[PDB]
Amino acid sequence: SKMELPDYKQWKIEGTPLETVQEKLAARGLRDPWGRNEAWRYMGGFANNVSFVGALLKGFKWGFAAFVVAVGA
Amino acid sequence: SFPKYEPSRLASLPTTLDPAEYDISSETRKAQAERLAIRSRLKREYQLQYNDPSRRGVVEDPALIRWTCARSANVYPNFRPNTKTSLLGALFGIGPLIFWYYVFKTDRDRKEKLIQEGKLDRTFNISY
Amino acid sequence: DAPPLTLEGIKDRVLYVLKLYDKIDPEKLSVNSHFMKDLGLDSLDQVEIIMAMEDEFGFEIPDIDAEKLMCPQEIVDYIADKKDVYE
Amino acid sequence: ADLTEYLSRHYKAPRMVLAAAGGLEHRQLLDLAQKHFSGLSGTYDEDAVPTLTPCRFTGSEIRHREDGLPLAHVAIAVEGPGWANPDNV
Amino acid sequence: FLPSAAYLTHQQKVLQLYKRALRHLESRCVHRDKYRYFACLLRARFDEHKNEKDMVKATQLLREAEKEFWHGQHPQPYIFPESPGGTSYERYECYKVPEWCLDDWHPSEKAMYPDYFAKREQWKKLRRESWEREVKQLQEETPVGGPRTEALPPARKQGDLPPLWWHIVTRPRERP
């Protein structure tokens, strides 16, 4: 039984929210996070999911063409 | 930085701020150890009379039978008629009863007079 | 509604999420190792390890049980007790 | 036994103060403490430790009438400042 | 109020307050990264005064910590859907027959499942054979008349099982 478990030393965190909070916490003077545990929660097929208004923008990124075809009908 | 959480008959005091768990006496720790000893002996004999494969039936709790006979049969002894018992008996046995009595006579006399005159809704009032 | 589990797989997953942590080395991280003695973390970081694996596996363990883990072998054993990992 | 409990519970190395004055060096007294007062109890019992409960000043009066004395002693008192505020000053 | 001891080892009370404050801050704070920031700030605040060698100062800070925690708590902590009071709390409890039963089936169905019932019979042999002398003698010999604990010793003698194993081992799978 294999699952093959995509391993460590792969993330190398680099991400924008954890990077900003590490820099803020370093300028605060702590420099002791948990680690890179949020990287698979942050990037991959993640990392620029759409905002609120874009979810309503999803409605008309394909329907205008068919609507103008139906008006021309 | 708070009004210090007043306790009440509903306000259950949580085990964080007791604050009696600060100046703990050594004899209170000894009382806690005695409490541990009581629970230890009771669960020990529970596991004695509980895991027996030779045993068949119920656990025969003496304390639950003790509570039930205390709650049902141990009421009438003991008892003495005191001031509080007699007063509370007159308050819960006679008070609301005579309250409903006077309001029923009052509403009945209103109905009796209003049908004694005849100005009721008896245009059709079939199902009496 | 039937997630399969295995003892070696969940052992490798707990070892993996231990290896993800910062201040212990990824080189010397045993299956059978102490926590307070050799890995160089205190009580507080150990309970942070406990909290993170509670958050990942979706069921807490109590502080009356959090006194007495001390090693990943008993962690895998206790989580296997909660999950009852056989076919 | 109760005196032994008093000695075991109260006379404790975290809460005791060695203070001295005169013609003697601070490092000399440090040396004497490092000999003798290093290695005391320093270890409490099963968390049975005292803490200052906030005392409840009621405010009331007591009188002890006893008419065989030549003089009379009358004391009156009100609230205290404590130690921290400059109200004590 | 604990199985093993009577007191609860003050360090552990501090650790309990640590876990409950961290859990309530999980419930307080979404987005997980500002949460990580706030948790590291709280962890630093605890490490500001870790090596205080007193005890009365420690429990005074504990009292003030309890006051600030009870003021700044949260009504619904994020308790897990296996935790007590949570979403499940034995959600699939419906199929929890304890296995003292299943011997009261009809022998047609007992002919239907022969292997499990013969192996149940050999577990029953294993239960009965080690029950009397070793179990009762270890319970009556090594403890004092005040048992003083809740833990039971292993049967380290030569062979067979440590006592009380039946209901502890033979409890259901917790997910039918």
Domain range annotation of chain E: 8-77, 97-173
Q: Which residues pair with C21 in a beta bridge?
A: A35
In a domain, C62, yes or no: yes
DSSP 8-class letter at D14: G
Distance from CA of C8 to the nearest CA of E (A): 20
Nearest CA in chain E to B2: E71
In a domain, C3, yes or no: no
3-state secondary structure of A35: strand
**Could you say which of E9, E10, E53 has the minimum Cβ distance to residue D14?**
E53
Buried b (16+ CB within 10 A) or exposed e, E147-165: beeeebeebeeeeebbbeb
| Alpha carbon distance A27, B22 (integer Å) | 38
D47 touches chain E (CB under 8 A): yes
Listed in sequence order, the residues at least 6 apart from D8 whose beta carbon sits closer than 8 Å to its beta carbon are: D45
Residues of C known to be catalytic? 42
The data reach a resolution, in angstroms, of: 4.6
**Could you say which of C47, C54, C60 has the minimum Cβ distance to residue E15?**
C47
Range of the domain at C67: 9-83
Solved using: cryo-EM
Buried b (16+ CB within 10 A) or exposed e, B61-86: eeeeeeeeeeeeeeeeeeeeeeeeee
Listed in sequence order, the residues at least 6 apart from D14 whose beta carbon sits closer than 8 Å to its beta carbon are: D42, E53, E54, E55
| Alpha carbon distance E169, E158 (integer Å) | 21
In a domain, C1, yes or no: no
Nearest CA in chain D to B19: D53
CA gyration radius, chain C: 13
In a domain, C2, yes or no: no
In a domain, C4, yes or no: no
B43 contacts in E (CB within 8 Å)?
150
E131 contacts in B (CB within 8 Å)?
52-53
**Beta carbons of C10 and C79 less than 8 angstroms apart:** yes
Quote the Cα angle for A20-A25-A29, to 5°.
145
Chains with at least 3 CB pairs less than 8 angstroms from chain A: C, E
Listed in sequence order, the residues at least 6 apart from B80 whose beta carbon sits closer than 8 Å to its beta carbon are: none
CA distances to B6, C50, C58, C81, E35 from E81, in Å: 32, 18, 7, 17, 21
**Beta carbons of C72 and C33 less than 8 angstroms apart:** yes
Inter-chain touch E63–B1, beta carbons under 8 Å: no
Comparing C-alpha atoms, which of E86, A35, E72 is closest to residue C52?
A35
Chosen for mutation from E25, E34, E37, E41 (greatest number of chain A CBs closer than 10 Å) is E37
Distance from CA of C60 to the nearest CA of E (A): 7
E124 contacts in B (CB within 8 Å)?
53
CATH code at position C70: 1.10.1200.10
Contacts 24+ apart (CB under 8 A), B11-18: B14/E70, B16/E17, B16/E66, B16/E69, B16/E70, B17/E63, B17/E66, B17/E67, B17/E70
Domain count, chain C: 1
Angle between helices A16-28 and E33-47 (to 10 degrees): 20
Token pair of A31 as six digits: 């420099």
How many CB atoms neighbour CB E141 within 10 A?
Answer: 7
* Residues of E (46-75) whose Cβ lies below 8 Å from C: 46-47
